[PDB]
Amino acid sequence: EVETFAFQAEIAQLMSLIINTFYSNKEIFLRELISNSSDALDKIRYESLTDPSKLDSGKELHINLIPNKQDRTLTIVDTGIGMTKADLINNLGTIAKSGTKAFMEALQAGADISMIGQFGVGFYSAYLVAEKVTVITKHNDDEQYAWESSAGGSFTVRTDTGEPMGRGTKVILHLKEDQTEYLEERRIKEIVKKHSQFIGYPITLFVEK
Numbered sequence: 354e355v356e357t358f359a360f361q362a363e364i365a366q367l368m369s370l371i372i373n374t375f376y377s378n379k380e381i382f383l384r385e386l387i388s389n390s391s392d393a394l395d396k397i398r399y400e401s402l403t404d405p406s407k408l409d410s411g412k413e414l415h416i417n418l419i420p421n422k423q424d425r426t427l428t429i430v431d432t433g434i435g436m437t438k439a440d441l442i443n444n445l446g447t448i449a450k451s452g453t454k455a456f457m458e459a460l461q462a463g464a465d466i467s468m469i470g471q472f473g474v475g476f477y478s479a480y481l482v483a484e485k486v487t488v489i490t491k492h493n494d495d496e497q498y499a500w501e502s503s504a505g506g507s508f509t510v511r512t513d514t515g516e517p518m519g520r521g522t523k524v525i526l527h528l529k530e531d532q533t534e535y536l537e538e539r540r541i542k543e544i545v546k547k548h549s550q551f552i553g554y555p556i557t558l559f560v561e562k
């Protein structure tokens with residue numbers, strides 16, 4: 354059973370801007386997703402200090418980067434706090450509305466797209482390089498869900514029947530045809546070293562084949 358939702362108009366406008374604006378420095382998408390993963394890992398780690406059972410779904414706190422040239426996907430996996438169905442449908446878009454407005458005014462005042470993370474909407478930088486984004490997520494308090502959007506104003510949510518994750522978030526970037534450089538090991542290593550060198554969780558870059 355697949356549910357289809359409309360983005361809020363302001364979020365649809367942000368995604369169109371990200372997709373349509375000429376902006377060569379696309380590699381910052383990875384910094385934003387890794388930073389999002391680090392934030393999610395901070396949250397479950399802090400919650401586990403007063404409720405150790407919150408780690409019954411997985412003790413390991415890490416980030417995995419998985420390229421797949423056959424599928425042309427780059428997957429960012431973390432074992433963070435995960436995301437509820439209400440997060441996917443309502444809560445994140447509510448917070449994103451005010452950050453999008455602030456980001457919009459900042460851009461007209463001279464800011465650039467690489468500053469997107471300062472406004473809490475860095476996730477949408479994924480559409481700098483991805484024609485479609487699939488998000489698999491599991492929060493301790495909810496079921497495992499699959500969120501998906503190719504932009505165009507709508508997204509879907511379904512219960513995920515795939516491999517159980519235990520806890521966390523998997524962001525699957527279906528890359529645009531001219532953005533396959535982000536499947537190369539040397540390119541990903543360069544970006545992580547440049548932008549994410551002090552993340553306080555192990556980042557493992559998987560090797561292809």
Ligand SMILES: NC(=O)c1ccc2c(c1)CCCO2
Pocket residue numbers: 440441445446448449473474475476488500
């Ligand atoms: N607004 C945000 O910062 C955000 C983050 C993650 C995320 C979404 C939105 C949409 C659902 C899938 O995952």
